[PDB]
Amino acid sequence: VPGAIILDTVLMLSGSYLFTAIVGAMGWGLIFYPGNWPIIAPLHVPVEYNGMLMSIADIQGYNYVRTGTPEYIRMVEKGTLRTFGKDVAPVSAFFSAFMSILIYFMWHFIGRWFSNERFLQST
Amino acid sequence: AVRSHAEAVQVSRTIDWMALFVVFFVIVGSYHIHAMLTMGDWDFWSDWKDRRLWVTVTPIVLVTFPAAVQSYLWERYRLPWGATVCVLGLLLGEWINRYFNFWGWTYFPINFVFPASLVPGAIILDTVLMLSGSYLFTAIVGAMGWGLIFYPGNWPIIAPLHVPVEYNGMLMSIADIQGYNYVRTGTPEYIRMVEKGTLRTFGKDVAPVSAFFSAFMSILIYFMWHFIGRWFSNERFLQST
Amino acid sequence: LLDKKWLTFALAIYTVFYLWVRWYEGVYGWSAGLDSFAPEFETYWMNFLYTEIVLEIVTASILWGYLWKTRDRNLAALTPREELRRNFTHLVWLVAYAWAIYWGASYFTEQDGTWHQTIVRDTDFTPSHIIEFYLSYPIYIITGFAAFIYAKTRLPFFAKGISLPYLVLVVGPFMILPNVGLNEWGHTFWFMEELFVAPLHYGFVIFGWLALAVMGTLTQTFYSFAQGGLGQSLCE
Amino acid sequence: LLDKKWLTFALAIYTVFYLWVRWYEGVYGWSAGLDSFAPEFETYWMNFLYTEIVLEIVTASILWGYLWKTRDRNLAALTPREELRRNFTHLVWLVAYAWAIYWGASYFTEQDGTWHQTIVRDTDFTPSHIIEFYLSYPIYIITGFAAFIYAKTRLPFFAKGISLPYLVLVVGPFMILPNVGLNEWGHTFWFMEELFVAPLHYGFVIFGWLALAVMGTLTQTFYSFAQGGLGQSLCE
Amino acid sequence: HGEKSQAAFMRMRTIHWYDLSWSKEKVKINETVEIKGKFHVFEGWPETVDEPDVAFLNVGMPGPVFIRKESYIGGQLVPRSVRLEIGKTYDFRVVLKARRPGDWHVHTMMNVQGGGPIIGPGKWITVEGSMSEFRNPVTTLTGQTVDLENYNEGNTYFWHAFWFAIGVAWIGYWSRRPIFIPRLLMVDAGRADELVSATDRKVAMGFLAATILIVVMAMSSANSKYPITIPLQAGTMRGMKPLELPAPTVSVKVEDATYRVPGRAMRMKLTITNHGNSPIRLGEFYTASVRFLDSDVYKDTTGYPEDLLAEDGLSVSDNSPLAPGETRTVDVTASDAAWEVYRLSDIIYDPDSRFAGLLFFFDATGNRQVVQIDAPLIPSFM
Amino acid sequence: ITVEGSMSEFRNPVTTLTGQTVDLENYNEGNTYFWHAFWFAIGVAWIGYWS
Amino acid sequence: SWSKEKVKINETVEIKGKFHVFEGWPETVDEPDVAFLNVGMPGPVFIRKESY
């Protein structure tokens, strides 16, 4: 909802669709993780679980067995040798904001087409 | 308005010089970004200037801006030097960075970080367009020549770097020794996308095969970018953004 | 009068400032600028980043606001001679934009390649990056926006509507700056090798292509130049 | 009269039938529905599949044939009040289509994710699949086709031609049903992991996008509503 | 200078550098400095790093302040990428020749094809002299000696200037006449067919023919001169010879490992079993380029970098000699300012809180044993 | 394997390194519900204001 | 080794030997994880009855 509200208000004010695609989509991408942090922060409390360090969410995934969803399917941050300092969340947020600008620009015109009131005479 | 015929001519000449500056340096910036992020690694290093990947990739990704700028300049002014101005601007930007940053900031030798030569291909593209003004004929024949003449055009420069050397028990070319000696901390040897040999590499065909593949793909990319430049020339007034 | 010496200043300010920036990065590239966690890095490059971002925001706001506030309300009662003078001033703005585009997208971008090709990048804010994305890019963005606003607010040809080629030429190269997010994301995660031709770089290339809209922009400025004072001489 | 209580039935029939279906799958999900080669699976889910396919074919044929046979031949001599009533009936049809689209493409699709994310899928006809693709999809396809046919055969605005947005809104979501072939092919062969975001799923997404044609469809229905009885009041 | 930013657990479990030595600490221009040592590829190689199937022995340095004269893995030269095996120990030797004056932090590093740079310990090496005195001679198989600093530079400059001049001549030839606005007006208003007329076509034909002919002639001339050329030599080199280390006589089991947040110390409880026939004592703990030493047991004499060396940073609860056959459990604390300076405390930010390292055990006679330990590293906050 | 009893009797306690014991069955459930309801209410308020 | 040098139609010829996979396998060639024992010949002038 925070991203949606940003996108809607940035469109209504300054009715420019280009301005929306640039600024509002930026905000939509950037506010996602901070918007969800109050919910998931309690699940990131570290726990000493049977000799291994695990977050509460990690223990949830371990305990509540998903027969069809093994752990390796999890596409999550695993660390890289080019992960400099404490930058994982902000870098991902900014990449998501830029790609959100691009996708918003594409889907504005996609929706423009989907609004067509044409009468295709024959199928 | 303008006072007389003479003042109109002087104003037109001043506009000519200023607009030439604008065209040249906007092309320098955009074309250099595109080139250095589509062929820069091969263009950076003599030990990357190989017969397969360098010869293949460089003309293909470098014919982009000449096609668009030709489709604009020739069509609107009958100025047959879009390809030449693109290539000259790219070479100027590349050489400025090589001299003042590659050799200036860092201290890599110029004989190690020199750029590739592209003026012969640009001249072919421009002359083949001006003669036989057909853009299709240009895309087919001139782009063929642009792709084919790349490696022979650069051979006088890189040939001395291919003299074999017996280096500490292993055979190495002079460019290989340059890449070995002048340490690139961020650029390990395995990143080098160069000819490494295959079991389906028949005889002495690596350079000509790559050149012909680059010429065909250059035809295709020129055809695409002619229309891309046609769009970029639009004089429309998008009423609202 | 017509074309005045504002063009000399337009060239000289960028030339001098960027020569000083190059001197600064030559002096502090190594030796306070290699280790991103050293205290001297904070005083010589993080402070540079902060100051340059604040100054760019302030300068952009002031320049764009002044250009928009001093917009010509009575464009109809503009003489052809004054229109020619304003066209020359807009051409000076375009020259400044081209110079800034060169400095941003060729010099500091490729010099950047060298930087990365020589050192192990330690952060998203390498002393040199700070120079390219947080200066060689905001500066040319500010210049392009200022040129577009000047055209829209002083030239009747560029008024009564937003020119599509000018908008593309002004906004596409701007999109390179938010594209830095893709650069970072696809440097640390995706792609661990320092390859300048890696797909994590196609966002810079795609929006570098939009600078080709300068062709339509320049034919539009040619038509604006040749409105009332087109001649005669030309085609006569 | 105008809008009558057919809307209440349109909502209630889908709500009640799908609540009963959910109860059925809650009772027989485990325990005759986990093992696809057990005899009880044949009596509780294969029989369900057969019966539902036969009933869907029969219902589609009967409904579409009746709607086409009772088509209004003399659309010219239709009073504005009757046109308004028919527009409201078509809006009720669109409401039923939206409700069925919800039940098919959100509820039973995502509940499906859960099913697969929890069990080892044993066949192309999991008790739950039978529910989604062989019910949550044919039912909404039937409703969409019926709404399109009603518009074409009772509304003069939607007559004299096939509306492109309506055709897209009606046929694109239908294409999800044959797309199940890609789902199966790219579950057993391609992709062995149960990932809902795997490319074997982009066929469902692409044709889910075509439901956005409801926007053009709805502005068309607004224009059809505002033909003779547009007011006045509105714009007055 | 590029580490302290990589993930702590990834620096801990990729490659362990030990027995590092530097031939000289201060050199003149053209003087050679040799870096030797061993590196062990950790068995628990992180899945996010591609296996070292294609690896390159590189040098961490700020540009070519040194030139890499030679580099060896095992005993053989490795100018190309090499294949390394997980769990194997290799010895390396890099020969550097000083080129640029100054104080340089020289690292030995291993670049892995799909994992990025693995930077080893870095040492400050002073270079004195002038860059103008640097020479890089090499003798070719054609019997000529050239200096790699300036060889072919004149030819490159000449050819680039020649082709740039040709292009500039073309552009200027077309730029003598008015360029943009009159030509645009001529093209727009009616058919143009007047701005491109003979002898413009003749000049363009001359340009095209001259370009093709000059390219062909230059290629032929560059083939007559330098008649012997070879392509670039590339390709990953297999069959790197690993060290045949004796099986360790010490077995260590890590029973929990903790570090305080915040803090500069790491604590672990080890069960050490002494096999063989000599009393052993724990002398060193190396985790990621940081050597925690028990000064009462072992002292470093190889000139290890001071900021990476903890002379008394290793405290063992009971470091009395361990008789053969005897098993005891001790509390080992590795504490030094390096643990926070090199951000080894930032493993709390990592998505995999596991550490790896090397324990060096020394007996009375002085011969040493290397054992590898790896365990989860549990932060402690209260 | 036969399981007897009631699901309501199930407990999944865990002790964190911060010194608190929580039940994984319902830990953070109230906070999640509260935040989701709050943001949904904000969006509904926006839509109703315009509606 | 080759069992025969000259054969009649329908007659069998057997080719035996050993091959050693070189340790320094070139990186440009994928590792022989998937390999097929084939016969180099101009079309089915022989039919491969067996291969071991």
Ligand SMILES: CCCCCCCCCCCC(=O)OC[C@H](COP(=O)(O)OCC[N+](C)(C)C)OC(=O)CCCCCCCCCCC
């Ligand atoms: C109002 C104007 C003035 C404010 C200007 C802000 C400048 C940057 C602040 C950095 C905060 C910090 O602390 O550094 C960065 C922090 C982590 O910090 P760290 O863990 O200490 O990193 C250790 C290394 N260091 C000490 C050198 C910092 O996260 C990040 O990596 C964020 C990376 C973002 C990359 C993509 C950005 C795209 C921008 C697009 C613009 C249109």
Ligand SMILES: CCCCCCCCCCCC(=O)OC[C@H](COP(=O)(O)OCC[N+](C)(C)C)OC(=O)CCCCCCCCCCC
């Ligand atoms: C129009 C622009 C609106 C921007 C709104 C920003 C609200 C404040 C966010 C604080 C984030 C924080 O606290 O730091 C960064 C943290 C991640 O930290 P982490 O190191 O991964 O650790 C995680 C654990 N924590 C939370 C205990 C440390 O959150 C983020 O991923 C947000 C990244 C995007 C920041 C956008 C602001 C920068 C300028 C944007 C314009 C170019």
Ligand SMILES: CCCCCCCCCCCC(=O)OC[C@H](COP(=O)(O)OCC[N+](C)(C)C)OC(=O)CCCCCCCCCCC
């Ligand atoms: C045209 C665009 C102009 C935007 C100017 C920037 C406004 C920043 C507002 C404050 C955000 C903040 O303070 O929070 C951002 C947090 C910092 O995270 P942290 O340092 O890791 O830890 C938390 C430390 N706190 C608790 C002290 C915050 O998230 C990030 O890492 C994102 C930082 C990258 C910002 C890139 C901006 C590039 C602008 C380029 C202009 C030419």
Ligand SMILES: CCCCCCCCCCCC(=O)OC[C@H](COP(=O)(O)OCC[N+](C)(C)C)OC(=O)CCCCCCCCCCC
């Ligand atoms: C004016 C008209 C008459 C001239 C016609 C020329 C015919 C070919 C000459 C071959 C030269 C030679 O020598 O063979 C080929 C030489 C290498 O030679 P090798 O090492 O001896 O190869 C050993 C094997 N052999 C003895 C059988 C040759 O390079 C090449 O592999 C070139 C390969 C090019 C492939 C793509 C071509 C696309 C063409 C598109 C057309 C529109």
Ligand SMILES: CCCCCCCCCCCC(=O)OC[C@H](COP(=O)(O)OCC[N+](C)(C)C)OC(=O)CCCCCCCCCCC
């Ligand atoms: C419009 C068409 C214009 C064509 C202009 C050609 C100029 C002459 C080039 C001689 C090349 C050479 O000498 O042989 C081939 C060599 C490569 O040889 P290599 O075996 O890799 O060894 C490298 C070391 N050398 C040089 C010591 C042997 O160079 C090339 O890669 C050029 C390949 C493209 C040739 C194009 C001509 C064929 C017909 C084209 C029309 C269909």
Ligand SMILES: CCCCCCCCCCCC(=O)OC[C@H](COP(=O)(O)OCC[N+](C)(C)C)OC(=O)CCCCCCCCCCC
């Ligand atoms: C419609 C298109 C018609 C084009 C006709 C061909 C003109 C050739 C001009 C001479 C080039 C030359 O002699 O040089 C080409 C060199 C030969 O290289 P090499 O043999 O390896 O060694 C060097 C040996 N020299 C020093 C003796 C040259 O490069 C190549 O390998 C490219 C050869 C492939 C040419 C494919 C042409 C296919 C045409 C098909 C028409 C239906």
Ligand SMILES: CCCCCCCCCCCC(=O)OC[C@H](COP(=O)(O)OCC[N+](C)(C)C)OC(=O)CCCCCCCCCCC
């Ligand atoms: C489009 C709008 C662009 C806005 C951004 C502009 C960025 C300006 C530079 C940021 C500096 C910073 O942040 O660093 C502050 C630096 C840090 O150096 P120091 O440690 O004090 O050493 C002593 C200073 N020396 C090393 C430079 C000798 O010191 C300063 O005060 C000096 C900054 C001078 C900048 C103005 C001169 C530019 C060249 C002349 C033609 C214009």
Ligand SMILES: CCCCCCCCCCCC(=O)OC[C@H](COP(=O)(O)OCC[N+](C)(C)C)OC(=O)CCCCCCCCCCC
């Ligand atoms: C668009 C056109 C859609 C056409 C498809 C409709 C599918 C209908 C269900 C198929 C059942 C099947 O196939 O199974 C037959 C089932 C198998 O259960 P049983 O073993 O007999 O147990 C005893 C039955 N209980 C378990 C249900 C108690 O028994 C039956 O006879 C009962 C089927 C009742 C369906 C009608 C009620 C729906 C809710 C009320 C609002 C409409």
Ligand SMILES: CCCCCCCCCC(=O)OC[C@H](COP(=O)(O)OCC[N+](C)(C)C)OC(=O)CCCCCCCCC
């Ligand atoms: C050169 C690029 C710099 C950024 C400017 C991009 C905005 C362009 C949008 C546009 O085309 O104009 C639409 C409206 C027109 O409304 P106006 O009737 O001009 O209102 C003027 C009074 N106002 C300052 C309160 C707005 O005007 C607006 O869009 C709002 C103008 C106020 C700027 C802040 C609005 C955005 C809030 C996030």
Ligand SMILES: CCCCCCCCCC(=O)OC[C@H](COP(=O)(O)OCC[N+](C)(C)C)OC(=O)CCCCCCCCC
């Ligand atoms: C997944 C991609 C999204 C689908 C969107 C593609 C729509 C393409 C537009 C289209 O269908 O053109 C219809 C013409 C037939 O024309 P006519 O029937 O003569 O109609 C006259 C007016 N008109 C020419 C403008 C249509 O061409 C025809 O031959 C009729 C074919 C109509 C099929 C369109 C239905 C699409 C449903 C998926």
Ligand SMILES: CCCCCCCCCC(=O)OC[C@H](COP(=O)(O)OCC[N+](C)(C)C)OC(=O)CCCCCCCCC
């Ligand atoms: C069927 C395909 C075979 C190849 C032919 C493709 C060329 C078609 C180009 C075209 O559409 O015509 C443009 C010009 C028209 O000029 P014209 O006024 O026709 O000049 C005729 C005298 N001329 C022979 C010297 C040219 O004419 C020309 O383009 C030049 C014609 C001379 C051919 C050689 C020119 C190309 C040099 C590389």
Ligand SMILES: CCCCCCCCCC(=O)OC[C@H](COP(=O)(O)OCC[N+](C)(C)C)OC(=O)CCCCCCCCC
């Ligand atoms: C990376 C891809 C290259 C970007 C090129 C895409 C350009 C697409 C063309 C476009 O923007 O259409 C503008 C219309 C708004 O129309 P209006 O503002 O009514 O202008 C009337 C005349 N016109 C309809 C022909 C434009 O549609 C709109 O809603 C306004 C959006 C304008 C955004 C275009 C700016 C592109 C900058 C990146």
Ligand SMILES: CCCCCC(=O)OC[C@H](COP(=O)(O)OCC[N+](C)(C)C)OC(=O)CCCCC
């Ligand atoms: C069209 C772009 C020109 C870029 C030239 C450049 O980067 O200059 C810096 C470089 C620096 O090398 P150097 O001149 O030896 O002076 C070194 C000073 N630092 C290290 C601060 C750059 O050389 C100059 O300053 C020459 C002046 C050219 C004026 C257009």
Ligand SMILES: CCCCCC(=O)OC[C@H](COP(=O)(O)OCC[N+](C)(C)C)OC(=O)CCCCC
């Ligand atoms: C327009 C051409 C785009 C081609 C993309 C490409 O070259 O990707 C190479 C990469 C193969 O990875 P690789 O080159 O092996 O990377 C080695 C280094 N690591 C493992 C750290 C990424 O493939 C992907 O990961 C998918 C790319 C999607 C493009 C939209």
Ligand SMILES: CCCCCC(=O)OC[C@H](COP(=O)(O)OCC[N+](C)(C)C)OC(=O)CCCCC
């Ligand atoms: C807008 C979609 C509503 C979906 C509600 C649903 O799936 O209901 C089934 C679920 C089943 O849980 P419960 O109520 O405990 O009854 C269990 C009966 N079975 C196991 C057959 C579902 O709860 C209800 O039946 C509540 C009635 C809501 C009416 C809109």
Ligand SMILES: CCCCCC(=O)OC[C@H](COP(=O)(O)OCC[N+](C)(C)C)OC(=O)CCCCC
């Ligand atoms: C619009 C983005 C599409 C990207 C496709 C993709 O993510 O594919 C991943 C997959 C890589 O396979 P992977 O994720 O390793 O699958 C692991 C599970 N198995 C081995 C059973 C398939 O690549 C392919 O096989 C080609 C896909 C073609 C798309 C048109």
